[PDB]
Symmetry: C2
Amino acid sequence: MAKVEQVLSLEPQHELKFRGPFTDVVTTNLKLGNPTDRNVCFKVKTTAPRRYCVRPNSGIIDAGASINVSVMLQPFDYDPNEKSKHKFMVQSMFAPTDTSDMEAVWKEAKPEDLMDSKLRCVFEL
Amino acid sequence: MAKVEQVLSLEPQHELKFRGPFTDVVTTNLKLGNPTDRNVCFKVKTTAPRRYCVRPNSGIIDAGASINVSVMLQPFDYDPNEKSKHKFMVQSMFAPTDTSDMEAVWKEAKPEDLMDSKLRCVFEL
């Protein structure tokens, strides 16, 4: 408000699942897609930095393009009945029609120019 | 010509191996040792930041303690011929017997105070 709903498609769109055993590093794709005629800068943020790694974490997705984001979980001791309270977030933003790059753009970005989307987390097995 | 050779112990010592298929993220551990009575600060760097991830990429190893560093390689088209020219750099420096944090310490650490060691990278299968 007046916040523009997310332009990017996500897949999955609501939650990211992880298949154990969580003996080793477990990984899962998030696919982002750009259905517009402008490039869309993105950031992929996480609730537990020390626990996850995102590749790519940021970037510009060309117009009409899709990229696969690797979300990677570090090994740990599962706990079956536990609930996963990690959230993953995608911040997007059209790389301004005249943009020089994607440097200090983020800090000076308005709340209007920003498009957010949060995803839940689930463990498995 | 100064100063010190790496305090820590690396395992593997020389060369990180990665086993295919590289259709998906590939992880190999580095296990860092701290044989000493003083906390060692580390920073694990690599050549291909958008190609690798390092959990943990920085931090402190308690005195006499070990850390297994997850080093994760992103999916890609693999040749069998192609060689790997990727280098993994672990930086280290004692956390002074009286220090208070590790914020600016890196940007004001000397070159002889600093501690480096380079690891080859190898792709398999």
